[PDB]
Amino acid sequence: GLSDGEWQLVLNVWGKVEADVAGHGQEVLIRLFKGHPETLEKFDKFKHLKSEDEMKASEDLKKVGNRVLTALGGILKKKGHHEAELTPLAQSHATKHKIPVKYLEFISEAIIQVLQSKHPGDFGADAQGAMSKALELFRNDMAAKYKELGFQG
């Protein structure tokens, strides 16, 4: 759905994230929890945290942040051929976590906001476009495996 040029702009900015996956991960989560507080409710381990300072101090949030961006970089580096990587993820998010597709949308946004903020020189207009389409592709594939797992997304 993305051209090669677009994969290139995606892998270029991912190279900046690769240096600090956990600190990036922790920042995406705080942005999501602040923007859409309803999403904090899905994480048992730290749904009690009320503020940013508490959030920044949680070792658990960081670790989870880490897991989440690690898995995502892995998908992105496949350039669209990520069936094997997405299967396990659709399976736990549709059964265990029960993450609605609107929630994958909010985190997408959150992702784009952090990149914009940290790496504007590696995230111009075209890159922003490419990243949005790559995340859309990911949500569309997630949604297709959720249907099959009988999870109304």
The angle subtended at Cα 69 by Cα 114 and Cα 127, nearest 5°, is: 50
Q: Residue count at the site for ligand HEM (CB under 6 A)?
A: 18
134 sits near ligand HEM (criterion: CB under 6 A):
no
Q: What type of residue sits at position 135?
A: L
Segment near ligand HEM (CB under 6 A); pick from 6-14, 18-26, 40-48, 120-128: 40-48
Among positions 103, 123, 146, 151, the unique one binding ligand HEM when judged by CB under 6 A? 103
- C-alpha 43/C-alpha 139 separation (Å) is 20
Cβ contacts of residue 149 below 8 Å, gap of 6+? 90, 91, 94, 95
- Residue 103: name the closest of 24, 26, 36 by CA: 36
| Contact with ligand HEM (CB under 6 A) among 11, 21, 22, 64 | 64
The residues of the shown chain that bind ligand HEM, judged by CB under 6 A, are: 39, 42-45, 64, 67-68, 71-72, 89, 92-93, 97, 99, 103-104, 107
